[PDB]
Amino acid sequence: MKVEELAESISSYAVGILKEEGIEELFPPQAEAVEKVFSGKNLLLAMPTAAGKTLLAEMAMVREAIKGGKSLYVVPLRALAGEKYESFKKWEKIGLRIGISTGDYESRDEHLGDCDIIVTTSEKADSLIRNRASWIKAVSCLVVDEIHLLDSEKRGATLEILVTKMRRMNKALRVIGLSATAPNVTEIAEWLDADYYVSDWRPVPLVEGVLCEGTLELFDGAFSTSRRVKFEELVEECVAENGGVLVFESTRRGAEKTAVKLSAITAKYVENEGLEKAILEENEGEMSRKLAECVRKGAAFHHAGLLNGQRRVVEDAFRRGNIKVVVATPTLAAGVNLPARRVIVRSPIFGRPIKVSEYKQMAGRAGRPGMDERGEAIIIVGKRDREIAVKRYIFGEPERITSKLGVETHLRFHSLSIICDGYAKTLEELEDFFADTFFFKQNEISLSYELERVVRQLENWGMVVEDHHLAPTKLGSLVSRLYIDPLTGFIFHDVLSRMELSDIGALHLICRTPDMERLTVRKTDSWVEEEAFRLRKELSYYPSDFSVEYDWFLSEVKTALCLKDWIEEKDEDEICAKYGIAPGDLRRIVETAEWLSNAMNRIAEEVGNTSVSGLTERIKHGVKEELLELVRIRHIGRVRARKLYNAGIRNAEDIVRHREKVASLIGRGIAERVVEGISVKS
Numbered sequence: 001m002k003v004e005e006l007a008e009s010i011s012s013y014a015v016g017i018l019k020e021e022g023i024e025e026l027f028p029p030q031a032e033a034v035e036k037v038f039s040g041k042n043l044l045l046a047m048p049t050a051a052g053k054t055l056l057a058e059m060a061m062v063r064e065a066i067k068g069g070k071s072l073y074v075v076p077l078r079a080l081a082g083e084k085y086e087s088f089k090k091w092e093k094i095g096l097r098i099g100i101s102t103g104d105y106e107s108r109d110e111h112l113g114d115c116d117i118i119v120t121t122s123e124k125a126d127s128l129i130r131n132r133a134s135w136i137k138a139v140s141c142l143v144v145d146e147i148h149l150l151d152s153e154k155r156g157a158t159l160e161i162l163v164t165k166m167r168r169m170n171k172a173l174r175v176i177g178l179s180a181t182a183p184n185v186t187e188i189a190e191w192l193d194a195d196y197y198v199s200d201w202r203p204v205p206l207v208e209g210v211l212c213e214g215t216l217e218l219f220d221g222a223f224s225t226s227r228r229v230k231f232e233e234l235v236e237e238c239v240a241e242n243g244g245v246l247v248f249e250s251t252r253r254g255a256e257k258t259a260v261k262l263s264a265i266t267a268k269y270v271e272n273e274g275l276e277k278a279i280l281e282e283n284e285g286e287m288s289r290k291l292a293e294c295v296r297k298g299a300a301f302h303h304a305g306l307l308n309g310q311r312r313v314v315e316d317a318f319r320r321g322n323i324k325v326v327v328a329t330p331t332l333a334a335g336v337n338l339p340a341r342r343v344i345v346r347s348p349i350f351g352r353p354i355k356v357s358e359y360k361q362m363a364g365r366a367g368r369p370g371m372d373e374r375g376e377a378i379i380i381v382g383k384r385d386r387e388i389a390v391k392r393y394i395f396g397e398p399e400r401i402t403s404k405l406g407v408e409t410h411l412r413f414h415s416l417s418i419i420c421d422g423y424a425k426t427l428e429e430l431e432d433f434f435a436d437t438f439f440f441k442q443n444e445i446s447l448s449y450e451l452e453r454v455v456r457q458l459e460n461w462g463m464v465v466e467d468h469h470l471a472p473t474k475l476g477s478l479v480s481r482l483y484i485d486p487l488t489g490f491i492f493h494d495v496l497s498r499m500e501l502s503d504i505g506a507l508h509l510i511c512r513t514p515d516m517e518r519l520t521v522r523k524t525d526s527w528v529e530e531e532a533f534r535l536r537k538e539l540s541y542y543p544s545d546f547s548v549e550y551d552w553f554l555s556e557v558k559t560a561l562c563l564k565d566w567i568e569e570k571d572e573d574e575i576c577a578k579y580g581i582a583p584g585d586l587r588r589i590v591e592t593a594e595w596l597s598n599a600m601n602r603i604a605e606e607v608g609n610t611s612v613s614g615l616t617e618r619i620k621h622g623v624k625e626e627l628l629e630l631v632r633i634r635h636i637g638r639v640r641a642r643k644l645y646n647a648g649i650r651n652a653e654d655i656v657r658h659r660e661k662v663a664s665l666i667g668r669g670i671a672e673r674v675v676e677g678i679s680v681k682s
Helices: 012-020 028-037 053-066 078-094 110-114 122-130 134-138 147-151 156-169 185-191 231-239 252-266 273-279 286-296 308-320 356-363 383-394 408-420 427-434 438-443 448-460 474-482 486-496 503-511 526-534 548-567 572-579 583-607 615-621 625-632 638-646 652-657 659-666 668-681
Strands: 043-046 071-075 098-100 117-121 141-144 174-179 195-198 206-212 215-220 223-228 245-248 299-302 325-328 342-345 375-380 464-466 470-472
Touching: 012 078, 028 043, 028 053, 028 195, 043 053, 043 185, 053 071, 053 078, 053 141, 053 174, 071 078, 071 122, 078 098, 078 117, 110 134, 117 122, 122 156, 122 408, 122 474, 134 156, 141 156, 147 156, 147 174, 147 185, 156 174, 156 408, 156 438, 174 185, 185 195, 185 438, 206 383, 215 375, 215 383, 231 245, 231 252, 231 342, 245 252, 252 286, 252 299, 252 325, 273 286, 273 308, 286 299, 286 308, 286 572, 299 308, 308 583, 342 356, 356 375, 356 383, 375 383, 408 427, 408 448, 408 470, 408 474, 408 486, 427 448, 448 464, 470 474, 474 486, 474 583, 486 503, 486 583, 503 548, 503 583, 503 615, 526 548, 548 572, 548 583, 548 615, 572 583, 583 615, 615 625, 625 638, 638 659, 652 659, 652 668, 659 668
Parallel strands: 043 174, 043 195, 071 117, 071 141, 098 117, 141 174, 206 375, 245 325, 245 342, 299 325, 342 375
Antiparallel strands: 206 215, 215 223, 464 470
8 A cells, every 4th residue: 555645644754664664565464454554433453463453543543642732542552561561662753742650549630631642551541530630521532442352351351341331431432342253253343342453464384283283284274284293393493494483381380391301402503691680680590590501592481470570571573583492381472572483382281171262262373474475384292182273273263252241240340430430329320330341342231230239249348438429438539549359458448447467467468458469388398387376376377277268278378478578588499499589570469469568558548557558569569668668779679678778878868978898799880870879969
């Protein structure tokens, strides 16, 4: 479409921006879709990612800004948000202000009001609405990326409620949904009152195959070919041509073992001693050293136990071809762009068989446009499951997208904020709200009976009052703005209004709530019961029987003991080994606990309980109180802070007055950076 044919709808300046990015002509599906893209009607675009639907959304947002509007772009994950924000920055060159929402817990991010394109997640967009962010009402166009996640038990409900809140607030809102292909995507279009464009076109053709007992059968449509080959050669022939290989495994253990195996192959072709160093800079425990050795050899594994920095290092080096093979778990976020000529799937389990949808998502990553004439996706399978792999996955179709909203926890969680935000003042109005959801579109089931039960539960919890009408209480408003589960708020409020808590008491209180991630109690964790009894008088409760409540309690206690070791400055590798977790797990647990500690303190303040104040910053840094002054300094975390403090250097003044000693204690380069920062701040 020559791109210049777009100059009438987006500016000629915008065409210029596209040319500077290299885009001279559009893909066939894009050219077919642009007319609907530049209309004012709601629109659903269902295409593979490689077919360029994000660019179509971008041009829609650019045109919306020229028309005097303002666009909110929502993604399901923070990482996806960073990627899209950085990619959208190019539009600043023609004067568009691009913003991304903050990490703050209960903020309005009012600064974003003057942006023309705002990137956020769906949870954060809902939070911004709950906190009365004033610029939401100025949004004229909402783009919902990955709207097929309506199918997800974890993420679908939030998408339904967010879209409904925005459409009821602004009748003139234009909604654009971006989806993977699925058999019923037009039902999503119908829910949005939208036009649609659906296409399976991809820029690189994909062939899909099964490897069984040393024979590969490969399919282009209904036509197949056969080859005598093994897994190792399938990887190596690709590595030798810098083609990029992505291997999916079911478990972390499998991914690590396969990455170590393949590193022997990749070592013949590359060495990255700098990348090995980068892998080890935050952590150098057992997993990290194994990963660093893989990376120096040109391989990597990729799972939730890596630190975020390690994941970023692996992803960038893979995009650069320094890392030849990445062995990942199926948790690998869809938005992580990992261009590979060849995808190899050895992960039959996920959690629970792998969905056809998930297999197809792994398969569609194969084929690097402009490099590969063909992408290959290969399932490795035993002779027993070979027919299943051929017939249900290779020749399968992705499942129908079906609402997961109709579950009591989602109904309770969202009904609280619907009532708090004023979207519904009566039971009939609450039912009317839910009649606008995708759930209702698919099922036409009125939830009156279930919603009544949920409202009664919220009323027994002190979150709402059913007077003449339905209203939030003070606690309900607070809980809604904190974005915690109503049950979490009830537990916090009930305990903190009755008693003061020690450290372990408040950590355990956090670990009682449904929002906290808890550790699994293993057969070797009898010390957890010992510690639970020894500390029981510090806890907000202790079970009476040895019922299943007791096992749940032991899980809460083990998680609280982990957080306790964290804030008592235990070495993080020792924490990982003691609790059977990886460094990335400890970071994720700590971040979740920090968020919930903040919410617990807000509730504590409202009831006049001072006994958990100070916990949140300790959880944030993993330090005893004495170190807080030091860790607020940039480049000073728990380790450097403890080293300085133990040498008598206990605040920024001491650092500045003892530069030489500081340099001997934590390194001269580090000390120069730290002194520079402190002198800057004064």
